[PDB]
Protein backbone atom coordinates (compact mmCIF):
# COMPACT_ATOMS: atom_id res chain seq x y z
CA UNK A 1 0.00 0.00 0.00
CA UNK A 2 1.12 3.57 0.05
CA UNK A 3 1.91 3.12 3.69
CA UNK A 4 1.88 0.01 5.76
CA UNK A 5 -1.43 -0.59 7.41
CA UNK A 6 -1.29 -1.31 11.09
CA UNK A 7 -3.64 -3.67 12.86
CA UNK A 8 -6.63 -1.80 14.23
CA UNK A 9 -8.61 -2.34 17.37
CA UNK A 10 -10.49 -5.55 17.69
CA UNK A 11 -13.77 -6.04 19.45
CA UNK A 12 -13.49 -7.83 22.74
CA UNK A 13 -16.30 -10.21 22.13
CA UNK A 14 -17.35 -11.41 18.76
CA UNK A 15 -20.64 -12.81 19.79
CA UNK A 16 -21.24 -11.98 16.12
CA UNK A 17 -23.94 -9.57 15.22
CA UNK A 18 -22.55 -7.47 18.03
CA UNK A 19 -25.40 -9.10 19.86
CA UNK A 20 -25.96 -8.82 23.57
CA UNK A 21 -26.17 -12.58 23.93
CA UNK A 22 -25.68 -15.70 21.90
CA UNK A 23 -26.79 -19.24 22.58
CA UNK A 24 -24.68 -22.28 21.90
CA UNK A 25 -24.40 -25.95 22.74
CA UNK A 26 -21.87 -27.32 25.16
CA UNK A 27 -19.19 -29.54 23.67
CA UNK A 28 -17.33 -30.35 26.84
CA UNK A 29 -17.45 -29.40 30.48
CA UNK A 30 -13.71 -29.12 31.05
CA UNK A 31 -11.94 -27.67 34.04
CA UNK A 32 -9.00 -25.37 33.62
CA UNK A 33 -6.50 -24.15 36.13
CA UNK A 34 -5.72 -20.55 36.87
CA UNK A 35 -2.62 -18.59 35.93
CA UNK A 36 -0.22 -16.57 37.95
CA UNK A 37 -0.28 -17.77 41.48
CA UNK A 38 -3.93 -18.55 41.94
CA UNK A 39 -4.89 -22.18 41.63
CA UNK A 40 -8.16 -24.06 41.62
CA UNK A 41 -10.42 -25.85 39.21
CA UNK A 42 -12.30 -23.26 37.25
CA UNK A 43 -15.27 -24.76 35.53
CA UNK A 44 -15.42 -23.97 31.87
CA UNK A 45 -17.25 -25.21 28.80
CA UNK A 46 -16.64 -25.26 25.10
CA UNK A 47 -19.65 -24.00 23.23
CA UNK A 48 -20.73 -24.06 19.66
CA UNK A 49 -22.47 -20.77 19.06
CA UNK A 50 -25.09 -20.51 16.40
CA UNK A 51 -24.36 -16.94 15.43
CA UNK A 52 -20.73 -16.84 14.76
CA UNK A 53 -20.85 -20.49 14.19
CA UNK A 54 -17.77 -20.00 16.24
CA UNK A 55 -16.71 -22.34 18.97
CA UNK A 56 -15.76 -20.64 22.18
CA UNK A 57 -14.90 -21.31 25.80
CA UNK A 58 -17.03 -19.80 28.51
CA UNK A 59 -16.84 -19.47 32.27
CA UNK A 60 -19.56 -20.99 34.41
CA UNK A 61 -20.21 -18.78 37.36
CA UNK A 62 -21.38 -19.81 40.82
CA UNK A 63 -20.25 -22.51 43.11
CA UNK A 64 -22.96 -24.45 41.46
CA UNK A 65 -23.75 -27.86 42.73
CA UNK A 66 -21.58 -30.08 40.71
CA UNK A 67 -22.83 -27.47 38.29
CA UNK A 68 -25.63 -28.10 35.97
CA UNK A 69 -23.84 -28.33 32.68
CA UNK A 70 -23.46 -31.47 30.70
CA UNK A 71 -22.24 -32.73 27.38
CA UNK A 72 -24.85 -31.16 25.23
CA UNK A 73 -26.80 -28.62 27.18
CA UNK A 74 -28.04 -25.46 25.57
CA UNK A 75 -26.56 -22.33 27.06
CA UNK A 76 -26.53 -18.56 26.67
CA UNK A 77 -23.30 -16.63 26.60
CA UNK A 78 -23.37 -13.16 28.12
CA UNK A 79 -19.88 -12.06 27.55
CA UNK A 80 -20.91 -11.15 31.06
CA UNK A 81 -18.58 -8.49 32.28
CA UNK A 82 -17.20 -5.89 29.96
CA UNK A 83 -15.29 -8.44 27.96
CA UNK A 84 -16.98 -11.39 29.59
CA UNK A 85 -13.45 -12.69 29.89
CA UNK A 86 -11.69 -13.80 33.04
CA UNK A 87 -8.26 -12.45 32.25
CA UNK A 88 -6.63 -12.74 35.56
CA UNK A 89 -7.93 -16.15 36.16
CA UNK A 90 -8.16 -17.89 32.86
CA UNK A 91 -6.90 -16.91 29.55
CA UNK A 92 -8.89 -17.98 26.55
CA UNK A 93 -12.25 -17.43 28.15
CA UNK A 94 -13.99 -14.54 26.44
CA UNK A 95 -17.49 -15.00 27.78
CA UNK A 96 -19.43 -16.02 30.85
CA UNK A 97 -22.36 -18.36 30.75
CA UNK A 98 -25.53 -16.86 32.02
CA UNK A 99 -27.13 -19.11 34.52
CA UNK A 100 -28.36 -16.27 36.59
CA UNK A 101 -30.87 -15.93 33.86
CA UNK A 102 -31.27 -19.60 34.39
CA UNK A 103 -32.01 -19.64 30.74
CA UNK A 104 -31.71 -22.83 28.86
CA UNK A 105 -30.05 -25.81 30.45
CA UNK A 106 -27.89 -23.77 32.78
CA UNK A 107 -29.73 -23.87 36.04
CA UNK A 108 -29.14 -21.26 38.70
CA UNK A 109 -27.36 -22.24 41.83
CA UNK A 110 -30.19 -22.73 44.21
CA UNK A 111 -30.62 -20.92 47.48
CA UNK A 112 -27.66 -18.70 47.04
CA UNK A 113 -27.90 -16.35 49.98
CA UNK A 114 -25.53 -13.85 48.53
CA UNK A 115 -26.51 -11.03 46.24
CA UNK A 116 -24.43 -12.20 43.31
CA UNK A 117 -27.47 -14.19 42.33
CA UNK A 118 -28.54 -11.05 40.52
CA UNK B 1 -6.17 44.28 44.26
CA UNK B 2 -4.02 41.25 43.83
CA UNK B 3 -6.06 38.11 43.59
CA UNK B 4 -4.01 35.20 44.73
CA UNK B 5 -4.77 31.75 43.52
CA UNK B 6 -2.66 28.72 44.25
CA UNK B 7 -2.06 26.33 41.39
CA UNK B 8 -1.12 23.49 43.66
CA UNK B 9 1.22 22.28 46.33
CA UNK B 10 3.27 19.13 46.10
CA UNK B 11 4.95 17.03 48.70
CA UNK B 12 8.23 16.49 46.77
CA UNK B 13 10.06 13.74 48.66
CA UNK B 14 13.77 13.12 48.41
CA UNK B 15 16.02 10.40 49.68
CA UNK B 16 19.27 10.90 51.52
CA UNK B 17 21.36 8.68 53.70
CA UNK B 18 18.94 6.22 55.27
CA UNK B 19 16.24 8.77 55.28
CA UNK B 20 13.54 10.47 53.33
CA UNK B 21 12.95 14.10 53.81
CA UNK B 22 10.34 16.15 52.13
CA UNK B 23 9.75 19.80 51.53
CA UNK B 24 6.74 21.47 50.03
CA UNK B 25 6.51 23.42 46.83
CA UNK B 26 3.67 25.75 46.10
CA UNK B 27 2.87 27.40 42.84
CA UNK B 28 1.03 30.61 43.26
CA UNK B 29 -0.48 32.92 40.70
CA UNK B 30 -1.04 36.55 41.50
CA UNK B 31 -2.99 38.93 39.36
CA UNK B 32 -4.81 42.24 39.19
CA UNK B 33 -7.13 40.85 36.55
CA UNK B 34 -6.24 44.06 34.83
CA UNK B 35 -3.32 42.79 32.82
CA UNK B 36 -0.75 41.99 35.47
CA UNK B 37 0.08 38.46 36.53
CA UNK B 38 2.95 36.85 38.31
CA UNK B 39 3.85 33.27 38.93
CA UNK B 40 5.97 32.24 41.83
CA UNK B 41 7.15 28.90 42.99
CA UNK B 42 8.44 28.78 46.47
CA UNK B 43 9.45 25.88 48.60
CA UNK B 44 9.63 25.49 52.33
CA UNK B 45 9.61 22.82 55.02
CA UNK B 46 6.02 23.68 55.67
CA UNK B 47 3.16 24.23 53.29
CA UNK B 48 2.20 27.62 54.68
CA UNK B 49 5.67 29.04 54.55
CA UNK B 50 5.89 27.75 51.03
CA UNK B 51 2.70 29.36 49.87
CA UNK B 52 3.56 32.65 51.42
CA UNK B 53 7.03 32.38 49.97
CA UNK B 54 5.56 31.74 46.56
CA UNK B 55 3.11 34.58 46.83
CA UNK B 56 5.90 36.98 47.56
CA UNK B 57 7.98 35.54 44.77
CA UNK B 58 5.08 35.76 42.34
CA UNK B 59 4.58 39.38 43.24
CA UNK B 60 8.07 39.89 41.92
CA UNK B 61 8.40 39.03 38.27
CA UNK B 62 5.03 40.14 36.99
CA UNK B 63 4.18 40.09 33.32
CA UNK B 64 2.18 42.59 31.45
CA UNK B 65 -1.34 37.76 29.29
CA UNK B 66 -3.30 40.16 27.19
CA UNK B 67 -6.76 39.30 28.41
CA UNK B 68 -9.22 41.79 29.82
CA UNK B 69 -8.12 43.99 32.66
CA UNK B 70 -9.55 46.69 34.89
CA UNK B 71 -11.75 49.08 32.99
CA UNK B 72 -9.36 50.97 30.78
CA UNK B 73 -8.30 49.75 27.40
CA UNK B 74 -9.87 46.36 27.04
CA UNK B 75 -8.12 43.06 26.67
CA UNK B 76 -10.24 40.21 25.72
CA UNK B 77 -12.95 39.38 28.10
CA UNK B 78 -11.60 36.22 29.61
CA UNK B 79 -10.31 35.33 26.15
CA UNK B 80 -7.23 35.75 23.97
CA UNK B 81 -6.68 38.28 21.21
CA UNK B 82 -5.67 35.82 18.55
CA UNK B 83 -4.70 32.25 17.74
CA UNK B 84 -1.09 31.32 18.17
CA UNK B 85 0.60 28.03 17.60
CA UNK B 86 3.88 27.39 19.27
CA UNK B 87 6.27 24.54 18.94
CA UNK B 88 8.79 23.92 21.64
CA UNK B 89 10.85 20.86 21.10
CA UNK B 90 8.56 18.16 19.79
CA UNK B 91 5.71 19.78 21.67
CA UNK B 92 3.30 21.99 19.83
CA UNK B 93 0.52 23.90 21.51
CA UNK B 94 -2.33 25.64 19.78
CA UNK B 95 -4.48 28.35 21.28
CA UNK B 96 -7.62 29.71 19.71
CA UNK B 97 -9.88 32.36 21.15
CA UNK B 98 -13.42 31.57 22.18
CA UNK B 99 -16.55 33.36 23.12
CA UNK B 100 -17.81 33.56 26.68
CA UNK B 101 -19.47 30.44 28.00
CA UNK B 102 -17.05 28.29 26.04
CA UNK B 103 -14.97 27.45 29.09
CA UNK B 104 -11.31 26.59 29.19
CA UNK B 105 -11.07 23.61 26.92
CA UNK B 106 -7.60 22.23 27.27
CA UNK B 107 -5.59 19.38 28.69
CA UNK B 108 -4.57 19.81 32.25
CA UNK B 109 -1.10 21.26 31.87
CA UNK B 110 -2.27 23.82 29.38
CA UNK B 111 -5.42 24.41 31.38
CA UNK B 112 -3.75 24.95 34.70
CA UNK B 113 -1.66 27.70 33.19
CA UNK B 114 -4.48 29.32 31.30
CA UNK B 115 -6.74 29.41 34.33
CA UNK B 116 -4.25 31.07 36.65
CA UNK B 117 -3.50 33.08 33.56
CA UNK B 118 -6.94 34.48 34.07
CA UNK B 119 -8.19 33.14 30.80
CA UNK B 120 -11.76 31.93 31.19
CA UNK B 121 -12.58 30.87 27.64
CA UNK B 122 -10.31 29.25 25.10
CA UNK B 123 -10.05 26.34 22.76
CA UNK B 124 -6.74 24.58 22.74
CA UNK B 125 -4.93 21.64 21.27
CA UNK B 126 -1.76 19.85 22.17
CA UNK B 127 0.03 18.20 19.34
CA UNK B 128 3.33 16.52 18.80
CA UNK B 129 5.21 15.39 21.85
CA UNK B 130 3.00 15.83 24.81
CA UNK B 131 5.48 15.81 27.56
CA UNK B 132 3.70 18.13 29.88
CA UNK B 133 6.87 19.22 31.46
CA UNK B 134 9.26 18.79 28.66
CA UNK B 135 7.70 21.42 26.65
CA UNK B 136 3.97 21.46 26.67
CA UNK B 137 4.10 23.84 29.57
CA UNK B 138 7.07 25.72 28.20
CA UNK B 139 5.34 25.77 24.87
CA UNK B 140 2.24 27.25 26.40
CA UNK B 141 4.23 29.90 28.23
CA UNK B 142 6.00 30.88 25.06
CA UNK B 143 2.69 30.99 23.26
CA UNK B 144 1.33 33.39 25.82
CA UNK B 145 4.35 35.64 25.64
CA UNK B 146 4.01 35.74 21.88
CA UNK B 147 0.49 37.12 21.97
CA UNK B 148 0.25 40.74 20.98
CA UNK B 149 -2.67 43.08 21.16
Amino acid sequence: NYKKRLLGTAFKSSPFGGSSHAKGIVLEKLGIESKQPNSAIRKCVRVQLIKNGKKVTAFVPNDGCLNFVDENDEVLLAGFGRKGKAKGDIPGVRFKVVKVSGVSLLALWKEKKEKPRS
Amino acid sequence: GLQDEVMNIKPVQKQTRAGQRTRFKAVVVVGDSNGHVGLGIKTAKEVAGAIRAGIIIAKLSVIPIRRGYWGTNLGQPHSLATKTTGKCGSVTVRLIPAPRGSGIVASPAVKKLLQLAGVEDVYTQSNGKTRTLENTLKAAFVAIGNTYG
Partner: protein, 127 residues
Protein backbone atom coordinates in the same frame (compact mmCIF):
# COMPACT_ATOMS: atom_id res chain seq x y z
CA UNK C 1 16.15 24.87 3.13
CA UNK C 2 13.90 27.86 3.34
CA UNK C 3 15.21 31.38 3.31
CA UNK C 4 12.47 32.53 5.62
CA UNK C 5 13.02 29.65 7.97
CA UNK C 6 16.69 30.40 7.99
CA UNK C 7 16.04 33.95 9.05
CA UNK C 8 13.69 33.01 11.86
CA UNK C 9 16.17 30.43 13.04
CA UNK C 10 19.08 32.81 12.95
CA UNK C 11 17.19 35.25 15.07
CA UNK C 12 16.00 32.53 17.38
CA UNK C 13 19.50 31.21 17.78
CA UNK C 14 21.10 34.61 18.20
CA UNK C 15 18.60 35.76 20.79
CA UNK C 16 19.29 32.74 22.89
CA UNK C 17 22.91 33.83 23.07
CA UNK C 18 21.68 37.36 23.55
CA UNK C 19 23.55 38.87 20.68
CA UNK C 20 22.55 42.48 20.35
CA UNK C 21 23.01 42.46 16.59
CA UNK C 22 22.69 39.60 14.18
CA UNK C 23 23.17 39.36 10.53
CA UNK C 24 19.75 37.92 10.27
CA UNK C 25 20.65 36.81 6.88
CA UNK C 26 21.33 37.79 3.41
CA UNK C 27 18.75 40.26 2.33
CA UNK C 28 15.85 39.48 0.10
CA UNK C 29 12.82 41.54 -0.75
CA UNK C 30 10.58 39.10 1.04
CA UNK C 31 12.80 38.83 4.10
CA UNK C 32 12.92 42.56 4.57
CA UNK C 33 9.18 42.69 4.20
CA UNK C 34 8.90 40.25 7.10
CA UNK C 35 11.31 42.19 9.27
CA UNK C 36 9.24 45.29 8.84
CA UNK C 37 6.34 43.65 10.63
CA UNK C 38 8.71 42.33 13.26
CA UNK C 39 9.68 45.92 13.90
CA UNK C 40 6.19 47.32 13.99
CA UNK C 41 4.95 44.60 16.27
CA UNK C 42 7.83 45.56 18.50
CA UNK C 43 9.56 42.22 18.44
CA UNK C 44 12.82 43.63 17.17
CA UNK C 45 14.47 46.94 17.74
CA UNK C 46 14.79 47.23 14.01
CA UNK C 47 16.83 46.00 11.10
CA UNK C 48 19.20 47.62 8.67
CA UNK C 49 20.78 46.95 5.31
CA UNK C 50 24.42 46.02 5.66
CA UNK C 51 27.16 45.09 3.24
CA UNK C 52 29.08 41.98 4.07
CA UNK C 53 31.75 41.02 1.59
CA UNK C 54 29.93 43.03 -1.03
CA UNK C 55 26.85 40.99 -0.32
CA UNK C 56 23.70 42.54 1.02
CA UNK C 57 22.61 41.39 4.43
CA UNK C 58 20.08 42.47 6.97
CA UNK C 59 21.28 43.26 10.42
CA UNK C 60 18.61 42.56 12.92
CA UNK C 61 18.56 44.41 16.23
CA UNK C 62 17.61 41.84 18.85
CA UNK C 63 15.77 43.71 21.66
CA UNK C 64 15.63 41.86 24.97
CA UNK C 65 14.09 42.56 28.34
CA UNK C 66 15.22 42.18 31.93
CA UNK C 67 12.62 39.73 33.12
CA UNK C 68 13.40 36.48 31.43
CA UNK C 69 13.37 34.71 28.11
CA UNK C 70 13.61 36.93 25.07
CA UNK C 71 10.91 39.36 24.06
CA UNK C 72 10.47 37.02 21.18
CA UNK C 73 10.13 33.87 23.14
CA UNK C 74 8.46 32.09 20.32
CA UNK C 75 9.02 32.08 16.59
CA UNK C 76 8.23 28.94 14.71
CA UNK C 77 7.92 28.29 11.02
CA UNK C 78 4.62 26.87 9.90
CA UNK C 79 4.37 26.58 6.19
CA UNK C 80 7.43 24.64 5.16
CA UNK C 81 8.78 23.50 1.86
CA UNK C 82 7.59 19.96 2.15
CA UNK C 83 4.11 21.08 3.02
CA UNK C 84 2.87 24.53 2.23
CA UNK C 85 0.28 25.90 4.58
CA UNK C 86 -2.46 28.11 3.20
CA UNK C 87 -5.32 29.37 5.28
CA UNK C 88 -8.58 31.05 4.46
CA UNK C 89 -9.50 34.32 6.05
CA UNK C 90 -11.78 32.09 8.06
CA UNK C 91 -9.02 30.26 9.83
CA UNK C 92 -6.37 32.87 10.18
CA UNK C 93 -5.83 31.58 13.73
CA UNK C 94 -5.64 33.60 16.90
CA UNK C 95 -3.26 33.78 19.84
CA UNK C 96 -1.68 36.31 22.11
CA UNK C 97 1.06 37.10 19.70
CA UNK C 98 0.86 37.42 16.01
CA UNK C 99 1.12 35.35 12.89
CA UNK C 100 2.65 36.61 9.73
CA UNK C 101 0.93 35.60 6.55
CA UNK C 102 1.76 36.37 2.98
CA UNK C 103 -1.15 37.40 0.85
CA UNK C 104 -1.37 38.82 -2.62
CA UNK C 105 -2.18 41.89 -0.60
CA UNK C 106 1.28 41.68 0.87
CA UNK C 107 2.71 40.33 4.02
CA UNK C 108 0.44 41.20 6.85
CA UNK C 109 -0.17 40.22 10.41
CA UNK C 110 -3.16 38.11 11.24
CA UNK C 111 -5.09 41.16 12.35
CA UNK C 112 -4.16 43.03 9.22
CA UNK C 113 -5.18 40.14 7.02
CA UNK C 114 -8.53 39.98 8.72
CA UNK C 115 -9.10 43.62 7.93
CA UNK C 116 -8.13 43.09 4.32
CA UNK C 117 -10.31 40.02 4.47
CA UNK C 118 -7.62 37.99 2.83
CA UNK C 119 -5.96 34.62 3.23
CA UNK C 120 -2.59 33.27 2.28
CA UNK C 121 0.26 31.01 3.20
CA UNK C 122 1.00 31.16 6.85
CA UNK C 123 4.65 32.00 7.00
CA UNK C 124 5.10 31.80 10.72
CA UNK C 125 3.89 32.64 14.17
CA UNK C 126 5.55 34.77 16.80
CA UNK C 127 4.63 35.91 20.25
Amino acid sequence: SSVLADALNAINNAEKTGKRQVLIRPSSKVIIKFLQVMQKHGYIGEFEYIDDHRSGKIVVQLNGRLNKCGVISPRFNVKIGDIEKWTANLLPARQFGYVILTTSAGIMDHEEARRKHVSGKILGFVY
